Design a binder for this molecule. Structure first.
Ligand SMILES: O=C(O)c1sccc1-n1cccc1
Ligand SMILES: O=C(O)c1sccc1-n1cccc1
Length: 148
């Protein structure tokens, strides 16, 4: 829950659509997108995209069955990603950040036609505008990774 290579991926639902949320656990930085279907294929695609942008070493999820997809495992394999086992399940920080992201989405929803755009507005607010040495999550992730 503190190595700089750990990301957590989960799905949540809004307006009948699926939002995939990835959290960089050490910093609190978020990546999220609306995806057309809650599937292993979309999970795998997202992992490939994420790993090309950030150094992804291990991945966790609050729904372990997500990672039983052979397409997910192939994306893993190709990108050199392993599964994270040092984070126990809380039947939660990451769950709460997901709930906070949904709150931000609601606050900006009427400023965009499509949910996908509101989600990106909320990610921007979460990573860049929120501050909590009073840096943003975007500042924290780059500092953590650069130091590593
Ligand atoms: O998409 C699939 O066909 C399979 S099969 C085993 C797990 C998954 N999955 C679905 C959502 C996230 C992962
Ligand atoms: O208003 C919209 O629905 C779209 S669609 C693509 C970008 C935007 N947007 C949102 C804020 C500023 C621009």
């Amino acid at each position: 829950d503190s190595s700089p290579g750990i990301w957590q991926l989960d799905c949540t639902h809004l307006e009948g659509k699926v939002i995939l949320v990835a959290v960089h656990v050490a910093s609190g930085y978020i990546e999220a997108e609306v995806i057309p279907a809650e599937t292993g294929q979309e999970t795998a695609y997202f992992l490939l995209k994420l790993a090309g942008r950030w150094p992804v070493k291990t991945v966790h999820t609050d729904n372990g069955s997500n990672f039983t997809s052979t397409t997910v495992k192939a994306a893993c394999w190709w990108a050199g990603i392993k599964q994270e086992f040092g984070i126990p399940y809380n039947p939660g920080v990451i769950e709460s950040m997901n709930k906070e992201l949904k709150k931000i989405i609601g606050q900006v929803r009427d400023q965009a036609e499509h949910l996908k755009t509101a989600v990106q507005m909320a990610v921007f607010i979460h990573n860049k505008k929120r501050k909590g040495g009073g840096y943003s999550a975007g500042e924290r992730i780059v500092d953590i990774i650069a130091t590593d």
